Design a protein around this nucleic acid. Structure first.
Ligand SMILES: NC[C@@H]1O[C@H](O[C@H]2[C@@H](O)[C@H](O[C@@H]3[C@@H](O)[C@H](N)C[C@H](N)[C@H]3O[C@H]3O[C@H](CO)[C@@H](O)[C@H](O)[C@H]3N)O[C@@H]2CO)[C@H](N)[C@@H](O)[C@@H]1O
Ligand SMILES: NC[C@@H]1O[C@H](O[C@H]2[C@@H](O)[C@H](O[C@@H]3[C@@H](O)[C@H](N)C[C@H](N)[C@H]3O[C@H]3O[C@H](CO)[C@@H](O)[C@H](O)[C@H]3N)O[C@@H]2CO)[C@H](N)[C@@H](O)[C@@H]1O
Ligand SMILES: NC[C@@H]1O[C@H](O[C@H]2[C@@H](O)[C@H](O[C@@H]3[C@@H](O)[C@H](N)C[C@H](N)[C@H]3O[C@H]3O[C@H](CO)[C@@H](O)[C@H](O)[C@H]3N)O[C@@H]2CO)[C@H](N)[C@@H](O)[C@@H]1O
Ligand SMILES: [Mg+2]
Ligand SMILES: [Mg+2]
Ligand SMILES: [Mg+2]
Ligand SMILES: [Mg+2]
Ligand SMILES: [Mg+2]
Ligand SMILES: [Mg+2]
Ligand SMILES: [Mg+2]
Ligand SMILES: [Mg+2]
Ligand SMILES: [Mg+2]
Ligand SMILES: [Mg+2]
Lengths: 59, 182, 142
RNA sequence: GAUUAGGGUUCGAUUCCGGAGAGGGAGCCUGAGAAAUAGCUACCACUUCUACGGAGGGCAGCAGGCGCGCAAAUUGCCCAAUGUCAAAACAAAACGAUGAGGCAGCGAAAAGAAAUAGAGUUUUCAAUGGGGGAUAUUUAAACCCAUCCAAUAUCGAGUAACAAUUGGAGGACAAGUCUGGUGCCAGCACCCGCGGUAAUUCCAGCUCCAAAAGCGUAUAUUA
RNA sequence: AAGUGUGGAGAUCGAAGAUGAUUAGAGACCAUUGUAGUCCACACUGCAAACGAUGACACCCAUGAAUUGGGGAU
RNA sequence: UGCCAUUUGUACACACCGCCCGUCGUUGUUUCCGAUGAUGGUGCAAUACAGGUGAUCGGACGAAAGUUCACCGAUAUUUCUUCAAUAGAGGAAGCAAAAGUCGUAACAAGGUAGCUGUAGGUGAACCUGCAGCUGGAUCAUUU
RNA sequence: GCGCGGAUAGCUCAGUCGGUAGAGCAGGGGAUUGAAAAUCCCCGUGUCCUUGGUUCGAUUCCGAGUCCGCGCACCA
RNA sequence: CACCAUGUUCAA
């Protein structure tokens, strides 16, 4: 038919999302010490890619 | 309702919140001076902006004008008093050349790092806020305390601090209780 | 060929400007009263209404979906409007005869892009926030 | 007041000044001053008690109540201060009244200051708040803050579990050619656009970015 | 210009309409006609691509053919 | 039937197998007209008129009750005006939505050059008459 | 008021004058497509008011009776 | 100067 969506299909993708849970991951420092952690990695530990990702299916 | 106590704002957020040149300078200023947030930089912007604006109004005024002799000798006085300008700089054109790291060097977090009372600039901010530094036998717990020139001689440990001449702090004292029950 | 000088020509310039400000669609909307008397919200924000029925509004070209939205009838002035329900799901949190807190969305009543003829938005259903129900901060009463 | 190079554009129910009103509308008395309303008379609209004969009401005072709405707190303590009134200083058997006005409770309207760690050789050493409490101090009385863990003699961080969040990662606009799912569906997207079985944009996990005790959104309004 | 009113005029072209034809259809173009109109008088209308898509009045402004009317030299 | 070059026009750009216009169907929306229905205030001025104020009498026990008249005037009711809201059979206009129908009007000399005004005709884009315009498909041909 | 008339899938509807049921759309899956729309194939499928008299059996016959339309009436 | 009307939706 002309329309392929319905009100009955509401929340289709969010229901069938496989429901992964977050992992443990101990807390980062907060406040002034988190700015210390930002500064030491992007400056003291030497384009600059802030989030370089490992190679995937694009190459 | 009938309360006339006044209050204003001391900082201002920048136009253009994502400038890659500006965001890189301010992360250097949060690292080189041990700052909590970008807002502590932004009041140092507004503090210096107001000095840079009044001193630029007074140069529109001629010399031997009443608002430039008075109140132009006030803004050169508070630069010399707080260490913003050394005593050679007396012409009022040097207030227009002040920078944000010229003001951030005068914070009590920086002098306690520069005088030698702490290993790092993040050691200094802890020891101020944990009541160890007295400026004139006055325990100052504010890191944004702008130290005057005459106050530099008298920064030391507090007389009530365990690092000075006071009683020993918590980890010795709660251990001295545990050795007492035995 | 444009305007007048003259040291005594200020009444001409004051009259000239007050008529040409009516051509400004921001000045004219801020100074006429068809702006609020036809606004379904009473010149305000976030008006409450009662859900009447659920509608699937099909998206405009080149997009193709049906947008899940309710038709609500406001309480302050009894005006029927159609308002969008934002997120994946979220008509499962709305039943008929529910009180909903409806804001506009975006563009001062000018129908944010894909959805045709819908210019309001559900914020809060049954006095609990609709985005809090989506992220499951809390759940519906009764 | 907000914004503003300059010229401006807006907001001003709201603390100070003035004007007006006390449910609507009149009309008066008394007084130096009222067309007074915690004064009177009447009508209109609502309205409470009655033993049915009758008698009363006026929170745009302060607390509250119901409605109305997108939308705004305690039926709190006190005259200690600021004042007003007045036959009146305080004290002495012997404390003038004050919902003016203070004070506290609620209170992320908006503003200041600021923790959530430091230091060193897997492994230790020091710190001091949040918080418990006082010979007490504040206070009218409490509260708070401030001071303190012996002055002969005062509790306490480790996963410091005493655990930061809110929005994003195609572009503007700072930051992933990562992995799983769905397959023009579900949804996202202010705008441009994403999604049609290899999604830089959806739903999620990771990892980053931004601001941070804050941060989204909506409607007004200035640039 | 079309249009309207009242009188004239009514040659030609001709909205409407009528016949032919073309066409899948032809309510169109093309052919033959033909009413109102076209033309005049007196009224009315005031709707144009009423254009140079360029408001009016002054000022300054380089060059070479021309052109229309007036004036002056030979 | 095609291809290549030059000139020119174009609203075309996955490029004429392009683009595109109106009527008609379906769905949803906001206005307007409309017999009739109806609401809240103003103003206007008309009577009736509560109370009071002043006056005149009164004088129970100087001075109450009460007369009478004037004035200020609430309220009630009616008459039109005016502002703001509102129901309506029916009749329309507009807008918005994934791929329904009919033609093909425009864009090329778009196959009758387009377009302005006006007048009349038509399912519908539109055609036709008259005078204009080039924004034309001609800046040009008795020197 | 009487008479003429019609009820068969989710809906709509054709019937051999008295031997048992036709499609189509709506539905679920494929072919097709770059995904769709159209299009083609294949699949679920209608105890026929209620029933009687019962032709070997009433859907198909006739008459009773829900349903829903149509022809026609005081008397001067 | 006979006639010569049209090509669904996104996307590449
Ligand atoms: N189209 C909707 C838009 O939403 C806006 O609404 C609001 C927000 O979207 C917007 O918030 C922005 C935020 O988006 C943006 N990322 C950063 C910015 N600082 C925020 O601004 C807000 O937050 C700061 C706190 O720092 C406040 O000081 C500031 O006054 C406030 N405007 O500021 C507005 C205040 O709530 C406009 N009100 C509206 O006119 C506009 O049309
Ligand atoms: N209150 C007056 C009512 O107007 C009605 O008239 C309605 C229609 O005649 C008229 O038709 C509109 C039309 O304006 C517009 N041009 C197109 C639109 N589709 C139509 O809409 C109408 O018809 C469609 C059905 O196709 C419906 O879906 C739609 O809800 C309905 N409003 O719009 C009117 C409502 O918007 C009826 N005559 C009747 O209910 C009554 O007269
Ligand atoms: N919308 C207001 C007006 O509608 C008219 O046109 C409208 C319709 O006549 C026109 O109809 C078109 C039609 O052109 C074409 N032949 C077929 C197409 N399916 C129709 O489309 C219409 O109908 C379908 C639903 O049937 C809708 O999904 C679609 O959005 C809508 N355009 O679509 C337009 C609706 O947007 C005027 N042409 C136009 O001026 C104006 O847009
Ligand atoms: Mg201490
Ligand atoms: Mg006042
Ligand atoms: Mg009244
Ligand atoms: Mg109150
Ligand atoms: Mg992916
Ligand atoms: Mg993600
Ligand atoms: Mg021919
Ligand atoms: Mg002829
Ligand atoms: Mg074609
Ligand atoms: Mg066709």
């Amino acid at each position: 038919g002309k329309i392929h969506g319905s009100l009955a299909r509401a929340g289709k993708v969010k229901n069938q999302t496989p429901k992964v849970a977050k992992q443990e991951k101990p807390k980062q420092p907060r406040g002034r010490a988190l700015k210390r952690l930002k500064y030491t990695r992007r400056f003291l530990s030497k384009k600059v890619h802030m989030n370089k990702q490992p190679p995937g299916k694009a190459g | 309702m009938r309360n006339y106590n006044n209050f204003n704002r001391v900082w201002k957020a920048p136009r253009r919140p994502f400038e890659k040149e500006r965001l890189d300078r301010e992360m250097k200023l949060c690292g080189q001076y041990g700052l909590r947030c970008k807002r502590e930089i932004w009041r140092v912007n507004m503090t210096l902006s107001k000095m840079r604006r009044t001193a630029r109004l007074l140069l529109t005024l001629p010399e031997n004008h009443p608002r430039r002799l008075l109140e132009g000798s006030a803004i050169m006085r508070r630069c010399h008093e707080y260490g913003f300008l050394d005593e050679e700089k007396d012409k009022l054109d040097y207030v227009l050349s002040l920078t944000v790291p010229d003001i951030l060097e005068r914070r009590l977090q920086t002098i306690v790092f520069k005088a030698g009372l702490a290993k790092s600039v993040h050691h200094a901010r802890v020891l101020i806020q944990q009541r160890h530094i007295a400026v004139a036998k006055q325990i100052v717990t504010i890191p944004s305390f702008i130290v005057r020139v005459s106050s530099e001689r008298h920064i030391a440990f507090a007389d009530a601090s365990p690092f000075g001449n006071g009683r020993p702090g918590r980890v010795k004292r709660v251990r001295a209780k545990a050795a007492k029950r035995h | 060929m444009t305007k007048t000088n003259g040291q005594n020509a200020a009444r001409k310039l004051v009259r000239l400007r007050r008529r040409n400000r009516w051509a400004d669609k921001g000045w004219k909307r801020a100074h006429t009263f068809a702006a609020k008397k036809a606004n379904p919200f009473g010149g305000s924000s976030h008006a409450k209404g009662i859900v009447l029925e659920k509608i699937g509004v099909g998206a405009k070209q080149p997009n193709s979906a049906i947008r899940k939205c309710v038709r609500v009838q406001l309480i302050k002035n009894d005006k029927k409007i159609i308002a969008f329900v934002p997120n994946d799901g979220c008509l499962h949190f709305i039943e008929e005869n529910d009180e909903v807190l409806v804001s506009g969305f975006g563009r001062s009543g000018h129908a944010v892009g894909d959805i045709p003829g819908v210019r309001f938005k559900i914020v809060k259903v049954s006095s609990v926030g609709l985005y809090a129900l989506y992220r499951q901060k809390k759940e519906k009463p009764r």
